[PDB]
Symmetry: T
Subunit: 68 residues, 12 copies
């Protein structure tokens, strides 16, 4: 009945959707009761060749197990 909230950033060369999804799946590997991920910010990183990386910051909350 008490949850930790954290922000994470996903990235992808394909889409904000895939960057988000990757980040949520990685989070689920280790905290395992994420129900909602809220989009906080979106941006793009760009290199000199013009390759774009889509980056997305998400807020996810998870039930804290009786631990520190």
């Amino acid at each position: 009945s008490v949850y930790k909230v954290i922000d994470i950033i996903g990235t992808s060369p394909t889409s904000w959707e895939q960057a988000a999804a990757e980040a949520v799946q990685r989070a689920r590997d280790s905290v395992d009761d994420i129900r909602v991920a809220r989009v906080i910010e979106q941006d793009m990183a760009v290199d000199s060749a013009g390759k774009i990386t889509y980056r997305i910051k998400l807020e996810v909350s998870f039930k804290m197990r009786p631990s520190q």
Copy 2:
């Protein structure tokens, strides 16, 4: 003499935020016939226990009120 109402509406899709937006815009157009702009207010995802993702988006749209229509 033109007064508009503004509402928020949410679309959802397994595919994308663009698809979730398009669903909500289509449903709004079935109710009113002068929507020209829909602004993105918030985006999120819902994740079910099996890890299936649904993309969700809240849009703000305005449309001209008809005389006598309720608030």
Copy 3:
């Protein structure tokens, strides 16, 4: 008990944001009798190709929900 609905409306005017706002409020009062305040949320101008300006203003108002009005 008493519960209220809040909505956002946009008035428009070739003259002023005050006139656009008064038009929106008067239209609102044609439907509900209990509006005593209207908060300004946003203002803009639309411009056509001749340069004719329409002042536009988004207002938030609230009013009592009547039970015989479906949500």
Copy 4:
């Protein structure tokens, strides 16, 4: 459901913002019963010339948009 309606509503109470919010939610649930989350947008108090306080709260709620339901 691919589309959800969103509305903002205000509840009031002489006793708590929690009561003001529960009343607003329960009144909305009378009309649409799949409301699962209500977000607090704004809180205030009205104070009458005797000093009597009314707690007021504005909530945003969403629910599946029905066929033939206005936006």
Copy 5:
């Protein structure tokens, strides 16, 4: 005339945010007397070294200034 001053004030209580607000509004009403609405701007808690909580709330109120009152 009819110019108002707008100020923020914080009330505190071990019991609730509503009581902390009531304390602040009652205190303000004995100095300035035409306060009709108090808006909640921020809420927090102070926790002491023993773990006792003090709920604290920042409110915005406006009151009519006397014709000659300094700023």
Copy 6:
């Protein structure tokens, strides 16, 4: 040098500019120091007959005199 900041509301049946000018002139009654007023918020009161009052909240700042309260 240190400046006090205050927020004030003016009102008018006619315009927000008048509402603002009224608030600003009242401020100028006890301080020759006001050079900018920022609009923070705008609304209208509407009475039962539907008469409108435009109201506007402004922020002003001015030098703190060594004997004034904050």
Copy 7:
């Protein structure tokens, strides 16, 4: 298509609408496809005599044309 966004400030002794109109016209003298100007901020400057100038900041967008720097 791709567009440029800019903020501009108009001023007037008369009204925020006139300040805004004036800035918009100025903008339109250079580009023909401004369709909306969003109000971002309003303020007033006030001189030592208490004379008021209404000032308004607006955000406008227009199609960027080859003969146009960023």
Copy 8:
């Protein structure tokens, strides 16, 4: 020169937002001694299919960062 860690946590309770906030403070103090302020970030309510309400509240807390353990 000291460094502090900042985290956000959410408490919940069927009773009130004050109680939801106290549950989250209690849980935080099980791990750290020196939380002294908890700022309210957001409040909402979750409503189950039976109409039962749970009050939820997101708090931001800071405390001394110790050389061990995570940023």
Copy 9:
């Protein structure tokens, strides 16, 4: 060094990503030096046949040469 910051809008019938990349590619035509573009706002234009245009407003910053 000193950088200029500008806002630009890209549009696409396909996606906000395509609208953004269009806008960034065009910016890098006038100044190759852009490394990040932050999304500021997103919206859609909808015509009377219900055809959607996705639009996105980006902030970019670049080394001021001027020149």
Copy 10:
């Protein structure tokens, strides 16, 4: 019953935003000894007509209400 006033104040300095803030706080403390925290709200610079910069900073401070600081 413990109620606090909140005010905004601005300090200025040709040297730094730190010195600007410190000047404001020191002036505030000349009147009210118990100010312990000041939050930065905004920073800017005023620039004169041959390039001299003045750093300015707006701070928010709170302190227990008292009749020598009416409001």
Copy 11:
């Protein structure tokens, strides 16, 4: 009377004040009427060896001159 508004970023190895001073002085090379610069955002770049650059984004306005 009409004014142009722009955002600019300055950097410094030593302070946000100096980073700001630099951006303001660079703007003044091009325009004469700048009277206020508002701070929008502050950040720091940090290289792989731990060296810090203070960066600041300012908004400035000035009268827009003919053409």
Copy 12:
């Protein structure tokens, strides 16, 4: 590449810059890939003697790794 983002507060009697460098330095003890720190909030504490402590809240992000559990 998935990153974690956290907020951290540095303090210093010297300046907000030095308070920021303190928090950045401390974070570098834990992770090595921090390249930018964004300022979120600034404040000061002041003691009864007028001694000031500058405080600054920074947001930083770094690639996820076992030693920095979520």
